[PDB]
Design a protein around this ligand. Structure first.
Ligand SMILES: [Mg+2]
Ligand SMILES: [Mg+2]
Ligand SMILES: [Mg+2]
Length: 1278
RNA sequence: CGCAUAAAGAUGAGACGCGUUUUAGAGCUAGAAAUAGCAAGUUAAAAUAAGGCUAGUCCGUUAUCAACUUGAAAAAGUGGCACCGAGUCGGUGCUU
DNA sequence: TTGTACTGTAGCGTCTCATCTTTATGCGTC
DNA sequence: CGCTACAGTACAA
């Protein structure tokens, strides 16, 4: 009758179990549908549901942004062609048409095969004249001759298409501020521009050039002018010119030849040194090592020069290949020092070109347009249009430019015209769109869902924070006393401690708070420092306009928008002080609204709740009481302020990977309720990933990072805080925190970093994001940009480890970086990335599973109890119970119910059953702890330490004998009782045998969730041309036999077809039954009309009613109970579970972890002799694995290999042997076959690359719990 | 639940630099040639999920998804119990 | 001409802006 | 709180 359900929830598994009051799992005879002979099957009410973990929308967002970028770049090119078309039709009408067909082959082109000029000799002359596009760019910038319009279009389209970063907001003119000769009109900067640019080097070299008459006041070449509102005093012009000079000359090599195109000059310089070094290297290789010439300059697969140009070898790979060849030869000293500087044989389109700003291209484009405006009037007519096309960028607060058909757009448009960069200002309403950029994202108030929350830096919200912490301060404080302490302490100090309170108010004019007050009026002090009017802030009438000021400052960050919103209030303030106020940027919003805290008033008292916090007589209630006190009128107002399950999950925001676990466990609960005849359970047990730790441990794990930086710098004895002071709240920034963690020095290059130019530096992940998802502090490293651009899909190389291993140790012993961070940095010493590094759990699954279990508690408590009364707010029909994993782990570790995850997927169901058993025993044994453990209820040395001790000692009733902390045992009798009632709640007799029997049960309903695969169509790598037909066409008109294409298509689901295929030169319709893979591209076309799609594949007389959709992980059953999961249409997977007996599992868990039990020496000796007397269990386990493999795995050669390896190493110690048998279950583990390894030998997987046997097998349609099945025998079809 | 300090992650927008693919950048000589010697190599165009229609400088890899009967779809409905045992579940007995 | 066996292959590095979450500790609260 | 299908080449019929 009565029963309980226990659940274990992971990111890939949902374990479920049903128990009665006797801790027994029921078994039922379930009906079986389908055409098979079986009509009833006995199944136990215990199992687990396995599924692929849900994916976050990060990758989809990156692909979407890339798609938008490509679309807008093509639109920029289209705008430029639209401008140029009228004049281009005069000189070459087919020119843009030839540029469009440049991808096509000779037969597919509709014009001459030469794109630019349409004939061989002119194209050859053009390429001889300009080897690169940069030669043409420099020629158009510098020369004054009238050039061909096609070359002008080529240059302009080159800089428009590839336009450089927009991280610099100033002008940074390269026409005259480029050259370092600004010093003579300042009073060269060449010295530090050759050396390392840093404050100390600038100071010492400035003293070296000129012993200063004023150390901080030299008025020229100072670090203040190198590294707009600060001009209120009136060296400014020369200061900004020298700043632009030092920045541009850091980006680009110097150009003493005067030109307006420094970038093209630097690229031509790279080309010239590349040509010279190539010729010299060819001569030296031919003269010294003639045998290596063929390998280096012809073999393109050996990372040589042919591999550097024609092959896929990068610059780093080519350098590390060619360094031994260069060092073993003679006369290669300068080439060696160029290779050390990474300046040898460089290309132009390199990885480090991301540092180049868009202003250089803007200057070059402006120079070309100024040169060519006289000859071509239309260039001068719309020079501003071309400049706008190059320089326009959609603001991030506007978003996509949709017309109401995008689920991501929030833009509103004033008019209905098409948006171009020229008329973007007169069409798009930037103010409302900028408002909606923040309003669409900030959350609503929980108590008032209908209206938005306040900013955190609101003055009203800060008065809230103060009086809400203060109202429970006891020495209760009266309202006059609270007013006085606020006036004399909170309005006078940004941070107030209890000592300042004691020695400033109570001395002349405490429990409930610790050493410092959490509440402060930071915004009040900021406006005191800005406005310089305490009376204006203290006035009550101007509260709403101050709130509008805070809202305006928080919503907007652009200067023009802030000034546009701020112009209404300009007649109370002076122009200098709104100019100073508009610099105050606010980020962060509060947890409460304006109406809930100061708009609503009590019906009888008439006060706002903030007034209630200011003065509550002697009661001194806070918001929690004031919303849960029935006497005030706030509770029913909040209550008045307050259908498919898919809708109950559609409205819950957050990561989409929580929805998979939520939906699976709720549907499992629903089906389990349906199975037992619509009878609701007594209580439902939820695995909670929460814990309880010591107060000291929790405070150590939650201390300020500012203290960590202080101890690290003090251990290293650095003075970076003396030069660069900082607070704790300024370390919330990622880049500043990583700069301070590395003591202002770059981690990959031995140089001092610049604190004021962190935007040009990159946050590298030591383990690549392409390899494994890990955004921890142990992985993040701040470094200069070009090095991180070079570290594409790689751990930093061996050379930087040998260079800077001393500094890594220096920071490691300074307690600034952890041991894991050092191991990541020194990963290249151990072989770098490998398959073993790929394995192991990651913390993202932990965070997602915590979110999932919290939502499990909420949704299950909402769904299960759907009844209430007028006096009883909810009838607790079902009690949702959340135990912590520690209690179940201790239950496993104290009564020898060990689990290992390597053997089978039964551990999920066993953990769920143990959850149910422990939860029911705990609620039955202590009904006074019902309100503690059941969700929705509440009971109302450190407190956390006391809670940890109480949760540690609560399980002591399970044990037969309890050993106290003094080493003395205690007696607790075998049969437990409820205490208040003589009811039996735990027997240390029959119930332990029952739980042993359940944990040894062989049949557990393990179900792999069948999913239709969705995602990318194929792998992103575009493969070269070939005669194979497996190449996927990259476009409709692009035949992959000529143009190449993608490979490895992903199939959505497989389809069983029964039709005829014309086989033989004498055509005859032979009937055939086979699986066909429906790829993701063909999914829509197949579901549109399956018959015509199958007819186009060569089939005919297709039995339409016989088509069975077979998604991935579809289950088939064959002889001797052998089951294969359909991985794809051409691949199967292992689908059987090995039910090893519990004694063998306990023996394996005790044999492994041989000397790391950390229990007691008597227990360690007990396990010592226990594993010693039963060493024959290894042979029994090998026999069991061999029998299971011969029955179901059908990998005979690998079986002989593992048997020979076990026989040859049977004299090894028990630790290593048992560890390798733990590794051995990978052969028999359900899922894809994987390559495991024994002691020394490595066993390659046996792949099941044949789906012929499942065409005559028994297809199983398992439900969400697998109890309801529909077996289909496919041999009766066709 | 609010405030404060952690840590690990989510959602959305604007951008950059590469990479890949085909074509253009006349290869020369000895050559019956299979080939061999020599020369050259750095750049550009186009595409960057096939595409879709509400045609937007928009959207297209997230989430949802056992089988059967109704329903365009959404959605709804569909499967006996007790006992004795256990190699992926079996056997025995009542029930309509 | 069609199945099997063994080995290799797979898109990548950031920058600037916003807002959130669930766990851990110190205070009040139900 | 987990963890490969497809490509390409070489042999058996
Ligand atoms: Mg990186
Ligand atoms: Mg689990
Ligand atoms: Mg999906």
């Amino acid at each position: 009758k009565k029963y309980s359900i226990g659940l274990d929830i992971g990111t890939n598994s949902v374990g479920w179990a049903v128990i009665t009051d006797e801790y027994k799992v029921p078994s039922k005879k379930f009906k079986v549908l389908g055409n098979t002979d079986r009509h009833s099957i006995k199944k136990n009410l215990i199992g687990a549901l396995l599924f692929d973990s849900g994916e976050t929308a990060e990758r989809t967002r990156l692909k979407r942004t890339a798609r938008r970028r490509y679309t807008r770049r093509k639109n920029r090119i289209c705008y430029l062609q639209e401008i140029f078309s009228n004049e281009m039709a005069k000189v070459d009408d087919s020119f843009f048409h030839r540029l469009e067909e440049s991808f096509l082959v000779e037969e597919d082109k509709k014009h001459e095969r030469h794109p630019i000029f349409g004939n061989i000799v002119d194209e050859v002359a053009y390429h001889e004249k300009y080897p690169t596009i940069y030669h043409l760019r420099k020629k158009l910038v510098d020369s004054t001759d009238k050039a061909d319009l096609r070359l002008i279009y080529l240059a302009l389209a080159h800089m428009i298409k590839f336009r450089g970063h927009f991280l610099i907001e100033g002008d940074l003119n390269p026409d005259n501020s480029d050259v370092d000769k600004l010093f003579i009109q300042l009073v060269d900067a060449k010295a530090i521009l050759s050396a390392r640019l840093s404050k100390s080097r600038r100071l010492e070299n400035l003293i070296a050039q000129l012993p200063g008459e004023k150390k901080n006041g030299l008025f020229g070449n100072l670090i203040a002018l190198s590294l707009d509102d600060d001009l209120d005093n009136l060296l400014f012009l020369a200061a900004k010119n020298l700043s632009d000079a030092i920045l541009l000359s850091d980006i680009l090599r110097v150009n003493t030849e005067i030109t307006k195109a420094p970038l093209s000059a630097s690229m031509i310089k790279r080309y010239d040194e590349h040509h010279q070094d190539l010729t010299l290297l060819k001569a030296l290789v031919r003269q010294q090592l003639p045998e290596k010439y063929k390998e280096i300059f012809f073999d393109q697969s050996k990372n040589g020069y042919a591999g550097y140009i024609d092959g896929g070898a990068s610059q780093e790979e080519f350098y590390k290949f060619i360094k031994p060849i260069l060092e073993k030869m003679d006369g290669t000293e300068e080439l060696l020092v160029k290779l050390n500087r990474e300046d040898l044989l460089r290309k132009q389109r390199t990885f480090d070109n991301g540092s180049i700003p868009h202003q250089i291209h803007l200057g070059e484009l402006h120079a070309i347009l100024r040169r060519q405006e006289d000859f071509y009037p239309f260039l001068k007519d719309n020079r501003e249009k071309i400049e706008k096309i190059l320089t326009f960028r959609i603001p991030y607060y506007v978003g996509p430019l949709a017309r109401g058909n995008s689920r991501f757009a929030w833009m509103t448009r004033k008019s209905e015209e098409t948006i171009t960069p020229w008329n973007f200002e007169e069409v798009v309403d930037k103010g409302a769109s900028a408002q909606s950029f923040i309003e669409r994202m900030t959350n609503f108030d929980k108590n008032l869902p209908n209206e938005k929350v306040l900013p955190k830096h609101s003055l009203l919200y800060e008065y809230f924070t103060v009086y809400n912490e203060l109202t429970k301060v006891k020495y209760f404080l009266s309202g006059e006393q609270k007013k006085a302490i606020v006036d004399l302490l909170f309005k006078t100090n940004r941070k107030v401690t209890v000592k300042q309170l004691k020695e400033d108010y109570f001395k002349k004019i405490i429990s409930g708070v610790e050493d410092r007050f959490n509440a402060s009026l930071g915004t009040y002090h900021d406006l005191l420092k800005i406005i310089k009017d305490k009376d204006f802030l203290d006035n009550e009438e101007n509260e709403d306009i101050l709130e509008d000021i805070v809202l305006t400052l928080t919503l907007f960050e652009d200067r023009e928008m802030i000034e546009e919103r701020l112009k209404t209030y300009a007649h109370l303030f002076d122009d200098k002080v709104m100019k100073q106020l508009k610099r105050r940027r606010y980020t962060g919003w509060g947890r409460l609204s304006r109406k809930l805290i100061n708009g609503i008033r009590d019906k009888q008292s008439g006060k706002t709740i903030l007034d209630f916090l200011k003065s509550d007589g002697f009661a001194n209630r806070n918001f929690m009481q004031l919303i849960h006190d029935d006497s005030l009128t706030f509770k029913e107002d909040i209550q008045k302020a307050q259908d498919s399950l898919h809708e109950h999950i559609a409205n819950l925001a957050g990561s989409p990977a929580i929805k998979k676990g939520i939906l699976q466990t709720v549907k499992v609960v629903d089906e389990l309720v349906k199975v037992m005849g619509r009878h609701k359970p007594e209580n439902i047990v939820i695995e909670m990933a929460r814990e309880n730790q010591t107060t000291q441990k929790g405070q150590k794990n939650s201390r300020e990072r500012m203290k960590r930086i202080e101890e690290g710098i003090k251990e290293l004895g650095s003075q970076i805080l003396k030069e660069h002071p900082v607070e704790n709240t300024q370390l919330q920034n990622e880049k500043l925190y990583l700069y301070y963690l590395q003591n202002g020095r770059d981690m990959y290059v031995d140089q001092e970093l610049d604190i004021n130019r962190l935007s040009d530096y990159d946050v590298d992940h030591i383990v690549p994001q392409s390899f494994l998802k890990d955004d921890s502090i142990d992985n993040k490293v701040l470094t200069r940009s070009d090095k991180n651009r070079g570290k594409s899909d790689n751990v930093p190389s061996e050379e930087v480890v040998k260079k800077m291993k001393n500094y890594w140790r220096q920071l490691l012993n300074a307690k600034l970086i952890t041991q894991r961070k050092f191991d990541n940095l020194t990963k290249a010493e151990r072989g770098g990335l490998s398959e073993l590094d790929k394995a192991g759990f990651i913390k993202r699954q932990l965070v997602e599973t915590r979110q999932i279990t919290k939502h499990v508690a909420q949704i299950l408590d909402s769904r299960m109890n759907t009844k209430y009364d007028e006096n009883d707010k909810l009838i607790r029909e079902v009690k949702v119970i959340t135990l912590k994993s520690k209690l179940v782990s201790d239950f496993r570790k104290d009564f020898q119910f060990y689990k290992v995850r390597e053997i089978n997927n039964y551990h999920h169901a066993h953990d769920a059953y143990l959850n149910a058993v422990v939860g029911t025993a705990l609620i039955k044994k202590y009904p006074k702890l019902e309100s503690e453990f059941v969700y929705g209820d509440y009971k109302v040395i450190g407190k956390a330490t006391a809670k940890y001790f109480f949760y540690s000692n609560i399980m002591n009733f399970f044990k037969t004998e309890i050993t106290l902390a003094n080493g003395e045992i205690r007696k607790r009798p075998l049969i437990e009782t409820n205490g208040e009632t003589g009811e039996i709640v735990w027997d240390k007799g029959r119930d332990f045998a029952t739980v042993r029997k359940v944990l040894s049960m062989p049949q557990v309903n393990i179900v792999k969730k069948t999913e239709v695969q969705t995602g990318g169509f194929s792998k992103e790598s575009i493969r070269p041309k070939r005669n194979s037909d497996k190449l996927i066409a990259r476009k409709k008109d692009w035949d992959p036999k000529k143009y190449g294409g993608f490979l490895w298509p992903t199939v959505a689901y497989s389809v069983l077809v029964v039709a005829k295929v014309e086989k033989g030169k004498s055509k005859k319709l032979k009937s055939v039954k086979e699986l066909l893979g429906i790829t993701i591209m063909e999914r829509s076309s197949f579901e549109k009309n399956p018959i015509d799609f199958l007819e186009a594949k060569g089939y005919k007389e297709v039995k339409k009613d016989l088509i069975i959709k077979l998604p991935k992980y579809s289950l088939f059953e064959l002889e001797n109970g052998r089951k294969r999961m359909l991985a794809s249409a051409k691949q199967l997977q292992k689908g059987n579970e090995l039910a090893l007996p519990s004694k063998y599992v306990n023996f394996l868990y005790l044999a492994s972890h041989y000397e790391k039990l950390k229990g007691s020496p008597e227990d360690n000796e007990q396990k010592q002799l226990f594993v010693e007397q039963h060493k024959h269990y290894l042979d029994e386990i090998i026999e069991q694995i061999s029998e299971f493999s011969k029955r179901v795995i059908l990998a005979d050669a690998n079986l002989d290999k593992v048997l020979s390896a076990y026989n040859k190493h049977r004299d090894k110690p028990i630790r290593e042997q048992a560890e390798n048998i733990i590794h051995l279950f990978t052969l028999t583990r359900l899922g894809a076959p994987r390559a495991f390894k024994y002691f020394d030998t490595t066993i390659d997987p046996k792949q099941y690359r044949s789906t012929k046997e499942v065409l005559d097998a028994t297809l199983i349609h398992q439900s969400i719990t697998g109890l309801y099945e529909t077996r289909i025998d496919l041999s009766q079809l066709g």
